[PDB]
């Protein structure tokens, strides 16, 4: 099924003639125009007051990474390397070994967040819950060094942000 | 050689070259061409500057993630040359100023500042120490900075017994005060370029030979300077009491010490490049 | 051994080509230096084509010459139309890459490349 | 002509006066390549200000031929 | 069966027997027309048929292929032959698509397709230009998608993946200057297969 | 929201049209930001028994190519012709 | 008809006479190919079944109608083209055997 | 004379940069040459080093303003090769998602091309709609434009509680938005002298220069993908294609309007004919099994452990798939060597074809007819270059 | 002495952040959430940012996209006639580092090969938001100037 966009006969009857006359003499299409951006000019504008008003987000947002522990403290990620594997970016590089309490954990775990795409398939092929992208979007640096994560930030980032983390978690899990 | 500092790569952006290089007066004419070349392959480089950070920027993309790494100094705090200096491998100093000003006369900048960096650096043990002086150095000059210039060159040698000392004529280039200098306006003249005496620093660096020499870095020819300012002109197609009476020291000539040749450089000739430093303004005959 | 000629049906046919494109090159060597103010001098820049010439002189296939010519056709095309910038003309002459050793001695104190 | 076509091939680099005859012959005696020749030919029409299609000058192998080509 | 893609065995039989029609028209150039079991259409022909089958595809009255689709090579270097040139082609009259697939190598010219359909000129500059086949007759062939001056032919398999040059800005020669490429991290080469056959249907004779 | 009577006439006016019960800015008629949790469900192959994955492997029922000439009557054509299409009842012309 | 509906193709006075010519053309030019080829058995057999259609129907949107391609103006240009096409058969001779075999694992996926 | 026209307007533009040389003689434009690759990031050679799942990003990239249009294709070209079938609650969402999606497109094509032309204000009344239609796609995938949502097998995840709710508030208001556009512009006569008959394009012409889309409905070919090959439900949804008469800049822009409108009415449809049911394929051999059967099941967690590091095999084979995005017939030329990566995947961009035609188009035009005619192609350099 | 000199440099800190004319260079997804931060919702043009600068009027180059080799000479042209002084922020992955196409071989792995950088605003692309927080953080660099009492004390 169609339809025409610009397919009509304009009537050559002397009235609509006039009609069209008045309208090129008298520019009445031009002020409907003007009509428009006038009514705007006594609209409510859409700005909002950024810092002190933000933009609404949903818990599934992807923002800056962190990486997470249990409730007792103990780090989730057990260096499985899924979030490494999947990466798209090749973002990831992590090492490991057994820690000195046979434990299985990293002994590197990094982020360039300049290669990163911010996709969160690490989230996704993560078993454990270990590594997540966090709520957070106001991360900008001076240098780009600033942006090559190591371990210790992210775990940092996981201790500043496991409040709200946590709670974003338990909001979205069921629908994974 | 500690393992971090051994080479390793194939002499790009990316490798390690061993070297880790603290550039006092990097902000400047010829530091910008010596922290271009340490950065082209792989050298970190501690970069202590009292400028404001904003005229450091073009500084920023001659090295590799985290290979230029910037400090606060000042001339006479030892304190802030100490952290400046604390590991690196080899101290460049090219602290300098063609006048002087309130705060800091010639004597500042060419005598104490110089020592102050010299002894601070032998206190941390840097192995390695590039002090550049002038061509012209002479304890009776008619200009303060040459008269300067000899006597911080004595106390360097005095605080740094094996100190590098290189003694460069007046140089040549795109952001030089010669060429730029007669642009915008007896004695002979054996100017040097910029990228020669850059690359015969890089090349002392890495020379075991150069430790407790003193080096004078000359161009080929030597030019009366009539002759040099009228090419400037014809090129072009067209200030202080102190810099005039520099100008007008004829270039002394000391063949007792080594010069480019023996770093493995060859100095380029002025006709070559004088295009390309005169041609935003729009040949002399030598002295055999 | 029976194939599809590009353009040459064979080597003399196909030098032909070469030495119209070696001309080409020659003449246009000046107008480059001026058009893109280069700091080379126009022997420069033609001792530069006579060795990306003479690099493949060892060449006997008339296939293989038709594309080198093709090739060298268009590079030419993309700096008499001023397509390329000053940083194309000068990519030939590699002026920020440092010499690499040649010898074995100077190759085995640097690395482990051959 | 023959006066003004030494005059070039005098004034080519590659090329000495001493070795330079109006009959030798530019590979086997001057020791130039099939390039140096593109290059004389070029000379010479920048000499005379006329044409010489490649077919014409691959066969011009000597001064004197040279001479004999552009006198037609 | 919900997870299972249904068949559609009347658009096979339709395209099956189109597939034999344009091969008894012109034996000449085809040598191979196969349907996949998705039910697309391909005739693998010898280079030589390039314009006389897609002139034929695109002004017969029973096909009228009047739309090129998308053109592009594929790099197999096990073929002696290791570029595969493919059409593909839609007919708005019959609500159709068909695949047109011949093969070249480094140094044989493929004739172009401009004069059948001018939607070519552009496919086949990127075809030149990433894989570095050459199209005969072509009004202006040239790159197109790499940097002035590049070298090689990026989409070729031997070709790798982060090239040999990269570029950089130079202070002292004041200009963007291209350098042998050096990586701080090395892309990380992954080995994905499974030891084990995924595919009975599609084994191969020992 | 908020607008003046005197002002909700101007620009009613002055537009042409309602704005006021169309406005582009959202107020209380969006969802609430905190929802309840769902309970999703599961798919078709969720069974204990009758369920053997070689009765629903899709990807084990692809085949080869159907080869119908290799080099190794009525015409016809790719498909029947496309059928000519309608005008739109809802509104034929703009 | 006042237009067409595709932009260039103009509306044509007298199609039924326009189709006459060119299926009589059409039909002319494959006398010029062998008769045991396939274009010009499958050409024919449409060529025929169309101007038999043409012959019979007087009514432009009946006709149109019985032979589905179209308006009557797109069926003209298709017999243009078909027209151009048994020219260039001709010369190409594609009823002729297989050029050349490709080589032996030429069309093998995967390999 | 020469000329080179601008990489890019002076105020935000998100096309990408375009080096225009141009021959002109007078004002007439005699010769247009496009040099393009400015934004060539070698997509198609990336690609061949991902598994599937790990491509799937790249789509997002290609057409940057209609994301989950090119999830779609590349999703539909995969479920092909794999012979497997997304459940139908998938197949409406990426129905609803894709013409939200064409939505999306459309304000940026008709806003842009306007702004271009010197008519900026449109562009900031119609980018606060685009700025609540980023929030749908943040509320389903948690990014506003890359969702990477559409997968082969389905999507990612399910709708959240409330989310069609909101659809439904902003689909109610939007034909009015609509509407206050062509106030501004549809009857207004610069906006008429700028577009009518120009970049004409003959119906011929148009199918042998490879148009597709919006540049064929303009010159009367009656072609849509969503009609003539229909994918996912499209089959299920009442919608009408707007046909132009004239094949001009002005006509075109009457069906991209036109577009949004049938877009919103089958929105519309989508809204109330949502079914139940799993949002991916309930096959775990291809799509991931819930988290919460990949922490208790043995097979789910091996099966969870394959796919995000080996990635799905698919069966050897090509595929040339197409969908109608919004800039025209977007598809891809898929092969699979029966492995996890795919070993070609040349990238079908509408743009490119149109873009190639700007030369033929641009003939007798002036050098300002340049700027309509490319807004009226609607060129996004991505999808261009790759 | 010190004082005047502080103010001084307060003033003019204060002009320059205030009116930041912005050079965006559109080069591919991330240009889109720059426009939606010159959209209502953040209305960039209220904080003093205009919405069209002419490369010769900026004071700031937003690189928003991905910088390929073919395009790397341009843009350092483009930077090299801004007139001081400049700042240049790199948006999004792309130009933070490569991102993505970081491992290609027609893309510049960051565009801090080319020009210093002095905001690097990460995601792909950032939000509106993100690059509006960037955007503030140039200004509050740009307060923490001292231009003036660097050359007192010269
Ligand atoms: C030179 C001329 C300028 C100097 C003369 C100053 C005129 C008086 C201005 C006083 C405005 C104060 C409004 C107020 O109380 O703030 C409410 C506000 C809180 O109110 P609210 O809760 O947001 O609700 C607002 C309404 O609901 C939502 O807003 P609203 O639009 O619905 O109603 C606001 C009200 C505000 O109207 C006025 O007060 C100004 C009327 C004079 C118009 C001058 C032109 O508008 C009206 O009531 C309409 C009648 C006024 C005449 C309108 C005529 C329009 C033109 C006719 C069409 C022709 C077009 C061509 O408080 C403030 O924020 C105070 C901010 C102060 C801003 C500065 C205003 C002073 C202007 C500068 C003076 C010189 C220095
Ligand atoms: C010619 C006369 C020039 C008049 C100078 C006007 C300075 C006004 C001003 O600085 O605003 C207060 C400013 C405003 O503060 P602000 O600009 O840092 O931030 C305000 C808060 N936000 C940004 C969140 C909205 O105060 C200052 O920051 C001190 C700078 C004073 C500059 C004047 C030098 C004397
Ligand atoms: C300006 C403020 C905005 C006014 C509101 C706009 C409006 O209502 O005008 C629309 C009206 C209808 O015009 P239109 O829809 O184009 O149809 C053809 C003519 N009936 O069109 C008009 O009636 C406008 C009449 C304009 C009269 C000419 C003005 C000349 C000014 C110099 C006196
Ligand atoms: N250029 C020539 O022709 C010759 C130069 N030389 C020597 O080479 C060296 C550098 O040459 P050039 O680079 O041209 O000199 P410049 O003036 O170009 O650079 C001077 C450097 O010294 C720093 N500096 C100056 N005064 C002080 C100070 N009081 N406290 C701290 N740092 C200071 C400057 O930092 P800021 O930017 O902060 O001022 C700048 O980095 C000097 O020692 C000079 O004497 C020797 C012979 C010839
Ligand atoms: S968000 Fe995506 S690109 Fe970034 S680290 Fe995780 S998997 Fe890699
Ligand atoms: S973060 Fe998660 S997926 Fe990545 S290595 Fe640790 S446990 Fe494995
Ligand atoms: S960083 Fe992401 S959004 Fe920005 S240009 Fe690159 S791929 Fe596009």
Redesign the pocket.
């Given at each position: 099924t169609y339809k025409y966009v610009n397919l009509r006969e304009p009537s050559m009857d002397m009235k609509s003639v006039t009609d069209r006359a008045a309208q090129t003499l008298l520019w009445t299409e031009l002020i409907r125009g003007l009509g428009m951006t006038?009514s705007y000019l006594?609209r409510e504008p859409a700005t909002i007051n950024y810092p002190f008003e933000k933009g609404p987000l949903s818990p599934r947002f992807r923002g800056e990474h962190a990486l997470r522990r249990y409730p007792s403290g103990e780090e989730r990620c057990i260096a499985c390397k899924l979030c490494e594997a999947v990466c798209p970016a090749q973002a990831i590089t992590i090492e490991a070994e057994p820690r000195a309490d046979g434990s299985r954990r990293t002994t590197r775990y990094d982020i360039d967040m300049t290669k990163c795409i911010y996709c969160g398939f690490c989230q996704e092929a993560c078993p454990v819950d270990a590594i997540v992208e966090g709520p957070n979007f106001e991360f900008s640096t001076e240098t780009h060094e600033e942006l090559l994560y190591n371990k210790e930030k992210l775990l940092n980032n996981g201790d500043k942000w496991e409040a709200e983390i946590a709670a974003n978690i338990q909001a979205d899990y069921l629908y994974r | 050689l500690h393992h971090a500092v051994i080479p390793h790569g194939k002499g790009g952006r990316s490798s390690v070259s061993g070297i880790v290089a603290t550039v006092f007066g990097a902000t400047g004419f010829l530091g910008r061409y010596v922290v271009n070349h340490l950065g082209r392959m792989g050298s970190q480089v501690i970069v202590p500057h009292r400028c404001e950070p904003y005229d450091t920027m073009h500084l920023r993309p001659m090295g590799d993630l985290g290979q230029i790494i910037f400090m606060d100094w000042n001339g006479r705090d030892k304190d802030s040359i100490r952290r400046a200096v604390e590991h690196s491998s080899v101290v460049i100093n090219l602290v300098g100023r063609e006048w002087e000003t309130q705060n800091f006369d010639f004597e500042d900048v060419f005598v104490k500042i110089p020592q102050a960096i010299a002894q601070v650096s032998k206190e941390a043990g840097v192995e390695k120490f590039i002090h550049i002086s002038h061509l012209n150095a002479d304890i009776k000059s008619s200009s303060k900075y040459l008269r300067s210039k000899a006597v911080g060159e004595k106390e360097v040698r005095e605080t740094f017994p094996e100190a590098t000392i290189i003694k460069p004529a007046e140089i040549f280039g795109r952001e030089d005060r010669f060429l730029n200098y007669f642009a915008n306006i007896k004695t002979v003249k054996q100017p040097v370029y910029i990228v020669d005496v850059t690359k015969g620093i890089i090349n002392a660096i890495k020379d075991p030979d150069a430790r407790g020499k003193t080096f004078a870095f000359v161009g080929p020819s030597r030019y009366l300077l009539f002759d040099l300012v009228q090419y400037v002109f014809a090129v072009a197609h067209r200030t202080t009491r102190d810099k005039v009476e520099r100008i007008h020291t004829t270039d002394k000539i000391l063949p007792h010490l080594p010069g480019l040749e023996d770093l493995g450089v060859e100095a380029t000739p002025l006709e070559l490049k004088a295009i390309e430093v005169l041609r935003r303004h729009r040949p002399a005959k030598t002295i055999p | 051994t029976s194939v599809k000629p590009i353009f040459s049906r064979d080597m003399n046919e196909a030098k032909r080509r070469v030495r119209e494109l070696y001309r080409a090159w020659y003449r246009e060597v000046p107008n480059t230096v001026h058009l893109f103010q280069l700091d080379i001098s126009v022997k420069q820049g033609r001792d530069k084509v006579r060795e990306m010439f003479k690099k493949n002189a060892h060449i006997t296939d008339p296939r293989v010459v038709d594309l080198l010519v093709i090739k060298g056709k268009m590079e030419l095309e993309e700096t008499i139309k001023v397509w390329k910038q000053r940083t194309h003309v000068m990519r030939f002459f590699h002026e920020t890459e440092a010499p690499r050793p040649k010898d074995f001695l100077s190759k085995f104190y640097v690395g482990h490349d051959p | 002509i023959k006066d003004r076509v030494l005059y070039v091939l005098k004034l080519y680099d590659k090329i000495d006066p001493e070795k330079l005859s109006v009959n030798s012959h530019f590979m086997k005696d001057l020791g130039l390549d099939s390039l140096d020749q593109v290059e004389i030919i070029m000379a010479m029409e920048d000499e005379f200000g006329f044409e010489i299609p490649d077919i014409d000058a691959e066969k011009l192998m000597c001064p004197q031929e040279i001479v004999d080509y552009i006198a037609d | 069966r919900p997870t299972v893609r249904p068949r559609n065995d009347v658009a096979h039989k339709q395209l099956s027997a189109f597939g034999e029609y344009v091969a008894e028209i012109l034996p000449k150039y085809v040598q191979q027309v196969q349907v996949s079991c998705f039910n697309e259409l391909e005739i693998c022909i010898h280079p030589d048929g390039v314009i006389p089958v897609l002139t034929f595809l695109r002004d017969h009255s029973n096909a009228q292929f009047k739309s090129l689709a998308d053109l592009t090579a594929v790099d197999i270097p096990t073929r002696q032959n290791r570029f595969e040139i493919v059409y593909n082609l839609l007919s708005l009259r019959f609500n159709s698509r068909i695949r047109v697939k011949t093969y070249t190598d480094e140094l044989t010219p493929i004739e172009s397709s401009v004069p059948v359909y001018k939607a070519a000129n552009w496919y086949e500059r990127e075809i030149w230009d990433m894989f570095g086949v050459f199209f005969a007759n072509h009004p202006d062939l040239r790159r197109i998608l790499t940097d002035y001056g590049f070298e090689g032919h990026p989409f070729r398999k031997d070709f790798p993946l982060s090239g040999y040059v990269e570029l950089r800005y130079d202070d002292e020669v004041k200009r963007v200057v291209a350098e042998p490429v050096e990586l701080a991290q090395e892309f990380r080469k992954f080995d994905l297969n499974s030891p084990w056959e995924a595919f009975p249907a599609y084994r191969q004779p020992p | 929201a908020?607008?003046?009577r005197?002002?909700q006439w101007?620009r009613n006016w002055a537009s042409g049209r309602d704005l006021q019960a169309k406005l582009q800015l959202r107020y209380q008629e969006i969802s609430k930001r905190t929802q309840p949790p769902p309970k999703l469900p599961v798919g078709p192959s969720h069974k204990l028994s009758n369920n053997y994955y070689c009765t629903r492997d899709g990807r084990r029922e692809a085949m080869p190519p159907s080869i119908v000439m290799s080099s190794q009557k009525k015409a016809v054509s790719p498909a029947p012709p496309i059928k000519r299409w309608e005008l739109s009842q809802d509104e034929p012309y703009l | 008809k006042k237009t067409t509906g595709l932009v260039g193709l103009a509306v044509c006075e007298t199609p039924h006479e326009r189709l006459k010519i060119l299926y009589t053309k059409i039909l002319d030019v494959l006398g010029h190919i062998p008769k045991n080829a396939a274009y010009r058995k499958y050409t024919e057999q449409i060529t025929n079944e169309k101007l038999s259609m043409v012959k019979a129907e007087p009514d432009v949107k009946k006709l149109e109608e019985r032979l589905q391609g179209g308006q009557i103006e797109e069926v003209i240009l298709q017999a243009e083209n078909e027209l151009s096409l048994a020219r260039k058969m001709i010369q190409w001779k594609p009823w002729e055997p297989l050029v050349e075999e490709p080589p032996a694992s030429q069309w093998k996926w995967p390999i | 004379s020469n000329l080179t026209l601008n990489f890019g307007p002076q105020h935000p533009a998100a096309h990408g940069v375009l080096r225009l040389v141009m021959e002109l003689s007078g004002e007439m434009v005699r010769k247009c040459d496009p040099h393009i690759g400015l934004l060539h990031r070698g997509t198609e050679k990336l690609i061949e080093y991902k598994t599937y799942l790990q491509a799937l990003p790249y789509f997002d990239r290609l057409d940057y303003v209609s994301m989950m249009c090119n999830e779609q294709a590349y999703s539909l070209a995969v479920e092909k090769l794999l012979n497997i079938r997304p459940p139908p609650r998938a197949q409406w969402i990426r129905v609803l998602f894709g013409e939200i999606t064409r939505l999306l497109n459309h304000i940026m094509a008709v806003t842009t091309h306007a702004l271009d032309i010197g008519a900026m204000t449109p562009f900031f009344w119609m980018f606060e709609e685009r700025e609540k239609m980023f929030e749908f796609y943040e509320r389903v995938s948690g990014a506003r434009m890359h969702a990477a949502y559409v997968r082969p097998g389905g999507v990612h995840q399910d709708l959240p509680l409330g989310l069609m709710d909101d659809i439904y508030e902003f689909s109610k208001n939007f034909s009015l938005r609509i509407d206050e556009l062509e106030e501004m512009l549809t009857n207004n006569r610069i906006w008429r002298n700028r577009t009518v008959d120009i970049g004409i394009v003959t119906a011929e012409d148009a199918l042998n220069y490879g148009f597709s889309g919006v540049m064929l409905r303009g010159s009367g070919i009656q072609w849509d993908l969503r009609k003539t090959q229909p994918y996912d439900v499209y089959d299920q949804v009442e919608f009408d294609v707007p046909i132009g008469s004239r094949g001009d800049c002005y006509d075109r822009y009457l069906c991209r309007v036109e577009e949004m409108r049938q877009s919103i009415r089958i929105i519309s449809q989508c809204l109330n004919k949502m079914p139940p049911g799993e949002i991916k394929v309930d096959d775990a051999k291809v799509s991931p099994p819930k988290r919460a059967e990949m922490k208790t099941s043995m097979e789910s967690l091996i099966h969870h452990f394959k796919l995000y590091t080996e990635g799905y095999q698919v069966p050897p084979g090509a595929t040339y798939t197409a969908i109608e995005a919004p800039k025209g017939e977007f598809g891809v030329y898929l092969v699979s060597d029966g492995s996890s990566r795919p070993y070609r995947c040349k990238i079908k961009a509408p743009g490119f074809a149109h873009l190639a035609g700007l030369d033929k188009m641009s003939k007798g035009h002036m050098l300002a007819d340049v700027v309509a005619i490319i807004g009226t192609q609607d060129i996004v350099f991505g999808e261009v270059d790759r | 002495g010190e004082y005047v000199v502080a103010k001084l440099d307060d003033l003019i800190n204060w002009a320059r952040r205030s009116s930041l004319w912005p050079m965006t260079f559109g080069l591919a997804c991330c240009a889109v959430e720059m426009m939606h931060m010159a959209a209502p919702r953040y209305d960039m043009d209220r904080f003093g940012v205009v919405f069209r600068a002419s490369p010769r009027q900026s004071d700031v180059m937003i690189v928003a996209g991905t910088l390929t080799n073919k395009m790397a000479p341009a843009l350092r042209k483009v930077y090299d006639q801004m007139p001081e002084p400049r700042y240049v922020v790199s948006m999004g992955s792309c130009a933070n580092g490569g991102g993505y196409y970081h491992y290609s071989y027609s893309v510049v792995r960051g565009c801090d090969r080319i020009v210093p950088v002095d905001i690097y605003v990460p995601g792909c692309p950032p939000t509106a938001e993100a690059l509006l927080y960037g955007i503030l953080q140039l200004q509050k660099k740009i307060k923490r100037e001292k231009r003036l009492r660097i050359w007192y004390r010269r």
């Open positions: 006038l006594f | - | - | - | - | 908020s607008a003046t005197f002002i101007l | - | - | -």
